Design a protein around this ligand. Sequence first.
Ligand SMILES: Nc1ncnc2c1ncn2[C@@H]1O[C@H](COP(=O)(O)OP(=O)(O)NP(=O)(O)O)[C@@H](O)[C@H]1O
Ligand SMILES: [Mg+2]
Lengths: 319, 96, 69, 193
Amino acid sequence: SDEINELKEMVKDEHIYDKLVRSIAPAVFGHEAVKKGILLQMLGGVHKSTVEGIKLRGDINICVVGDPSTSKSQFLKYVVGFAPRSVYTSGKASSAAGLTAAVVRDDYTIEAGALMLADNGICCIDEFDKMDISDQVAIHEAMEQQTISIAKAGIHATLNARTSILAAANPVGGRYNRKLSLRGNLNMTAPIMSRFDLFFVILDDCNEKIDTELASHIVDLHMKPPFSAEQLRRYIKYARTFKPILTKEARSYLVEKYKELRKDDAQGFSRSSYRITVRQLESMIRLSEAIARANCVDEITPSFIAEAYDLLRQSIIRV
Amino acid sequence: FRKISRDRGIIDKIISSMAPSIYGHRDIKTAVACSLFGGVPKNVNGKHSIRGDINVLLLGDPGTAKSQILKYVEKTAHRAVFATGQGASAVGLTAS
Amino acid sequence: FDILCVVRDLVDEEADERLATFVVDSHVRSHPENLNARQRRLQRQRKKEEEISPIPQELLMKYIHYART
Amino acid sequence: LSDGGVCCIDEFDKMSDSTRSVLHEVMEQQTISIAKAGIITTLNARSSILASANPIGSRYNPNLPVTENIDLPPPLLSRFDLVYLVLDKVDEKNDRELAKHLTNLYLEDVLPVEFLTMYISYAKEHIHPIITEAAKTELVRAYVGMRKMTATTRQLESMIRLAEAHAKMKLKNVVELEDVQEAVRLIRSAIKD
Ligand SMILES: Nc1ncnc2c1ncn2[C@@H]1O[C@H](COP(=O)(O)OP(=O)(O)NP(=O)(O)O)[C@@H](O)[C@H]1O
Ligand SMILES: [Mg+2]
């Protein structure tokens, strides 16, 4: 009942949403957008099964692009330390089999890889860009169909990989080139970039007003947030029990905002899309559901659609 | 089945019913319908056997429901198997 | 592969309008919360299904198997 | 196996690529992730590494940067706190005195070489330095200075760790301004390579 009352005093607070984001990764300074994304990943979308049997992904996939100078791996260390049912792995150290699932003797049988172990969970892939394309393309099924399917050595299976993937890619050459598109800064391509719900780029050029307080924070951390980790986890567990619904106004407004992103993504005389596929409309649905969970309301207001549209625009204004 | 088969629009109602929660792509739904019903396998006096199965390739851009169409067909076909990309070895596909 | 389907994702304003409308409708139509109770729920599922499937999917599977065999 | 001890690696330039990748999570997280045969664990390595590496070919070219001479890639090279160059370039005022020092070992029988291990042991057992409040401002101003001169927070973290190590030396229980200053100075020498 003490925990019940802490939950009540948390949901009573009208602006708890800010307090949640500032409770993400408290040992790392700044980068509010990334922290907001990690909150809206531990709060997933609502997974759905259609009348035709076709599934819709609930999990949210996030990429954190950053130079090896940036405090980037801190987010992976945090969420794997915090979130239940999660794993850490390194991009080149893990193969395609090592990532989805391998086939081993004991007979022939299946050995669970990282994306199997993080089912109904979070998989954190550090140094993602160094992963070979052969290793990257293996996860295209687990990314979106939420499964791994195998046909090898007389063992045939399809395996559940309902997993929110968190990738920490470096830019090509380490340095992020601000003159180039997000497409140009990575060795990824549209099949896998469309599978991520959103990309964050986090940059660390010198700025004395920032660098002074950032340096001070590093020494403060060596001991010269509003909620504890326990309280945040309890809230996340409670918020995940909510299953928000799109209000009628939100549906039409979301169609308009998708048409805006879709229009702005068009390139070439063919009006080819690149970043905004149909997958990104569904990404906005997932993100607004996660936002509604963050606010513990069973109905999605158009303000959440506006926030989801702006969250995707953190990537779309960089092309 | 005998009743609904008489309908003048039955091919189109079947095709529209293929993967009903996927918008558009009536060409894909047609190709899937043709594949899923199949042709007639034939054998000419036992001296020459001919394929009845229809093979279909869904080639195209990301986020266009191709994988979802295949998962639907796995749902709908009376004997089905599904194997993505790097998950399929040569002997794991034919025999070992 | 004796049928080829080429699937191009082109920006096209009213086509994207219609597709996005259908997708958001599909998401609410697939939401989990959306005479005994089990019978009523199966009836509601059929009511949802006839919005988009001109013949029942359960009928379509047996019809396919019949036509094949 | 080098948990709690210095891991000495020679031929560090000729290291294999899987090993080059594996070094990242011991450099950062001091562990290595294992996920096979029904066992999943971050196997904690907790080791300080002393690397020894080489140029391509027989000679180092000091008119080219470290990345151009050495085989191993910059992001791994960046993780080291101190990085040094030792060169065979001829100079009799060095070489003659080196040769005399070397050759004199064959004739001769303060240098606390056997007490060094005991001093290290008691220092590691007893002394746990904490950062002085003034040393915060010293670290910040030094970091912003080298930042005004391409630094990253990894350099600041390195200066903290070196200053704490400097405080275990002299058996000092609190990091002083002079500890920060020597950590800063030695890193300023190193980062200029
Ligand atoms: N016409 C559509 N109607 C409904 N959903 C769609 C449509 N096109 C794409 N989607 C959604 O897009 C998501 C991805 O579908 P998917 O089948 O993986 O596309 P794909 O063609 O396989 N792309 P890729 O795997 O990169 O080659 C699914 O959640 C679908 O619901
Ligand atoms: Mg696909």
